[PDB]
């Protein structure tokens, strides 16, 4: 059949991508109905970004600061308000190709598609996960600020991320459309670090359950194990511990494969204890934690 | 900055995706202007596919066989011709959202974006490479037949693949829009195998040159080496040998990093000889051969 890490298609969200500028500052914005959302840190220069007071910087910005372009065409800003770290620019036009949308806040574990833009012109897309420590292993270059993370469930567009800033580490932070940052992070250039990255365990399990269906099944053992016992092994190797929900959610996989989730844990457990002796599952030599059981089911 | 395997956006090609059916047979087609392309094996059932004569099977098909739907709406077929393994259905309508397009035949080495469809309804997209042995490690389920592989260079759409068939191995074959199969493969269900899979070496090199720029540079040695010497090592481990072009193409990377390509070969060479002792380059424990130097440059 085949397995690959896979983004939703991007036609809908491409419809909503605009360029914004505020002096020398040029980033990406999202045009939904009569509104345009974008990172608020657009009103900053470099000298500002150290300790910026947004209350106080935007007190000094006018609607005639905010150049907003719709590809070839331009828009006219008609009122500027700031919600947390996102800036909501009202304009004269409603997006003619605004489609069924909704803002969601995702939880650390879920995955989403990302549309990397540069001057409102989308460049690319890739599937991505919301790390334990509320970060993302992304591809983000200067003025990818305002590029977004979405999903598509039954026509509706499920906007869940908007990018703000890279980190000294090199992983990327950003908010939802509420404007609230995923994590303890704020938009300034102070020595921010991100906590311990661990592995989305439930997901790896779904990735093994995947592997099986795709035929690849060298790594299967006989063993059973307790949940706790499995966990008292897993957490040693920086992995997320595992709940009765996790099992519940991994239920439909365990059906199609006639493999119990307990028996899969001791199987995984034994990869952690032993290693891989340089073999590959679904052609990978690391354990792949960026698949939710919904991702993998949908892929099948 | 960040690195991720990355597909072009899919809005353009989504515009051109249609469902086709021919009795009980339902696959994906591509509507460009007044034409619709699709895999010809759509005129087959299962009993046929063993040894089908297409000349002779289509002699028995009419325009009123060919149900062709445009999402909600339907089309009217008005003449059916077969070019190699692709079938060209003329219809009454030209695609209103046909954009600047061109058919290209890619060469074994190049990468492209893939739009997986089911009943003309796109499900997903992922970046993919045209293997040495003219195969692809894909995600393709029944009736992904007619899902396509494209690229975008400066507005133009560069259609380069259309899927036909999985293989007993589990990798996927298909043609260009010419209709000619990438590889020695034909559309029937005989015991087809695919030759030796080797590694797109130039690409791995571009993936190392990537790694460096992204800061990750544990794996650097001092050494130089000859091209031939490098090759007399590489080919042992099933890798594609390396040409003066390959070097030429890897030229602009070698500029930005102040690292000679010769010195990069002995560096790679030493991963092959030694291993990795379970470290990671750009967070991967296998060497990543699905990036062309154009991919990686564009990503930067």
Curated annotation (Swiss-Prot), chains A, B:
Protein name listed in UniProt: 3C-like proteinase nsp5
Covalent link (Glycyl lysine isopeptide (Lys-Gly) (interchain with G-Cter in ubiquitin)) residue numbers: 5, 90
Assembly and binders: 3CL-PRO exists as monomer and homodimer. Only the homodimer shows catalytic activity. Interacts with host FBXO22; this interaction promotes the proteasomal degradation of nsp5.
Chain's role: Cleaves the C-terminus of replicase polyprotein at 11 sites. Recognizes substrates containing the core sequence [ILMVF]-Q-|-[SGACN]. Cleaves and inactivates human TRMT1, preventing tRNA guanine(26)-dimethylation of tRNAs. May cleave human NLRP1 in lung epithelial cells, thereby activating the NLRP1 inflammasome pathway. May cleave human GSDMD, triggering alternative GSDME-mediated epithelial cell death upon activation of the NLRP1 inflammasome, which may enhance the release interleukins 1B, 6, 16 and 18. Also able to bind an ADP-ribose-1''-phosphate (ADRP).
Residues of the Peptidase C30 domain: 1-300
Subcellular location: Host cytoplasm; Host Golgi apparatus; Host nucleus
Reactions it catalyzes: TSAVLQ-|-SGFRK-NH2 and SGVTFQ-|-GKFKK the two peptides corresponding to the two self-cleavage sites of the SARS 3C-like proteinase are the two most reactive peptide substrates. The enzyme exhibits a strong preference for substrates containing Gln at P1 position and Leu at P2 position
Residues annotated as catalytic: 41 (for 3cl-pro activity), 145 (for 3cl-pro activity)
Cytoplasmic topological intervals: 1-300
Shown stretch of the complete protein: 3264 to 3563 of 4405
Effect of residue 90 to R: In strain: Beta/B.1.351
Control of this protein's activity: Inhibited by pyridone-containing alpha-ketoamides compounds 13a and 13b. In turn, alpha-ketoamide 13b (tert-butyl (1-((S)-1-(((S)-4-(benzylamino)-3,4-dioxo-1-((S)-2-oxopyrrolidin-3-yl)butan-2-yl)amino)-3-cyclopropyl-1-oxopropan-2-yl)-2-oxo-1,2-dihydropyridin-3-yl)carbamate) inhibits SARS-CoV-2 replication in human lung cells. Inhibited ex vivo by michael acceptor inhibitor N3. Inhibited ex vivo by compound 11a and 11b.
